[PDB]
Symmetry: C6
Subunit: 62 residues, 6 copies
RNA sequence: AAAAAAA
RNA sequence: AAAAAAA
């Protein structure tokens, strides 16, 4: 199920950990996980931006 | 759950937006409408963007 | 749907379109027909394009 | 539904039309449609090769 | 319907194969096993290839 | 499943692995955990990798 | 739209 | 692993 993905993202969100989100094309976005659902992650770095999970390679604490 | 309100808020306030595609290309315009699979992005003309091709949507 | 009426209008009105693919290649032609997964695009040839390979459909 | 895709491919198969299959990375394969199902197309050009539909951009008569 | 028998025939006859990935990379070895989502390709070691990453499977 | 036993063996035996991504980048580490959609890979950092971005998992 | 950069 | 080639 989502027994890894949801607790991993929730912890980053709860703890306001700065993250790097690497996209599948190698572009690295930085910010905080504001929220997420089945399909998207909202990545906040003053501005809120919506990232499709389909375009993400990895999520790592910065 | 979060996708629709995020896109709608941009449409509602006519926020100029950037849509970055999975291949790195940046498209700019206004969110005119959206459904399960697509976003209509308006500039001079309305073009239909497939969600599967999008990496991010962000105010410009 | 926003997608289906958009494609149907383009198809019925025989509107010249540009289809941009995920590899950056631009196809041009008229939308001859479409279904859940594919679009039939006609120019000098008649070609079945998978929607998963499309980024955008733009009136030319 | 598959009201376009299945009759398009079946006609190519039935009529033994030489086809070009462009992959999503721009590589062009050539051969005849031997058969297909939900996920793959078998492309025959003396040898039978299995092509995942997820990797295909377009199918066109050659 | 066609995928499983195609892969199995290659495994059964120990046919040396090429698996071409969506990014153009060619992997070579023997089909050792497969399930809904992956193919195990054996050379010196067995590596697990995700089907979503594969364009084609062909005898080498 | 062939996938789950393969990943589980790698995880339990703390086998160093190379994960090749769709963009050609090679990650290295140990499989800390996995579920339907993601793998947690640990090296000097602990990183959640989406399976859709992975081409292969190779014992290093 | 490089019959295909064991990455 | 180019905070991102209106293609």
């Amino acid at each position: 199920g989502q027994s890894l993905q949801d607790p991993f993202l929730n912890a980053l969100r709860r703890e306001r950990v700065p993250v790097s989100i690497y996209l599948v094309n190698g572009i690295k976005l930085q910010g905080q996980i504001e929220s997420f659902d089945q399909f998207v992650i909202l990545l906040k770095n003053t501005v809120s931006q919506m990232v499709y999970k389909h375009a993400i390679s990895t999520v790592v604490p910065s």
